[PDB]
């Protein structure tokens, strides 16, 4: 499977946008967690479908496929989020009708922190001018690199995508030396996405223990792992 065929396969696998309506009245702590938890749940279902379309994912053992999704689901969600808010500085596009402003994150006890590092990482992506094709690879890599014989298969799958990212970047035309630089700058961002995920899931866990909103089924299973 050539790098371009892998990228084209990922493009096609791009999940459709989950539509959700912004509450009619101004957000409350509950209404918001309500909208974010619902969105996440629905996006998770689409994420599993997306994963089974990632070249060679289904070939891994089920227990592996499980560990990967269990450890990266928030990162993949936030990487998608950030991408959607790319051309909207200061704004976080959780959905076509659910646009959140950095300031609205105050109706929630300690989520503004999350919203800020999300916007920040986004600005970096915008600054670097992340491309759609690069994005598809970075997102697919997040899943495969969350390894946090079958395993050996995993290494080969992750290299395939890396070759794809390299292939895409080369097509930008920039000097070889610069291709290494962009490739590096894009990946260094994975840690930031990783951080937001940790403080994002920790926050979510707290809310549940707080009963600030109902978190069950898929959303819950993923929370505990």
């Amino acid at each position: 499977l050539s790098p371009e065929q892998l990228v084209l396969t990922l493009l096609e696998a791009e999940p459709p946008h989950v539509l959700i309506s912004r509450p009619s009245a101004p957000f409350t702590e509950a209404s918001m967690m309500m909208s974010l938890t619902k969105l996440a749940d629905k996006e998770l279902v689409h994420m599993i479908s997306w994963a089974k379309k990632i070249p060679g994912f289904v070939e891994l053992s089920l227990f592996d496929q499980v560990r990967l999704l269990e450890s990266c689901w928030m990162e993949v969600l936030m990487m998608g989020l950030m991408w959607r808010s790319i051309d909207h500085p200061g704004k976080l596009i959780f959905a076509p009708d659910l646009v959140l402003d950095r300031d609205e994150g105050k109706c929630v006890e300690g989520i503004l922190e999350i919203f800020d590092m999300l916007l920040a990482t986004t600005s970096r992506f915008r600054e670097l001018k992340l491309q759609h094709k690069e994005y598809l690879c970075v997102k697919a890599m997040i899943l495969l690199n969350s390894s946090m014989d079958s395993s050996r298969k995993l290494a080969h799958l992750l290299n395939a995508v890396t070759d794809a990212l390299v292939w895409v970047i080369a097509k930008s035309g920039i000097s070889s030396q610069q291709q290494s630089m962009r490739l590096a700058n894009l990946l260094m961002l994975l840690s930031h996405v990783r951080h937001a995920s940790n403080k994002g899931m920790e926050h979510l866990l707290n809310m549940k223990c707080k009963n600030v909103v109902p978190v069950y089924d898929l959303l819950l299973e993923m929370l505990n792992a």
Partner: peptide, 9 residues
Amino acid sequence: KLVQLLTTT
């Protein structure tokens, strides 16, 4: 559930 979507869907 997670396993369901993976193997049943």
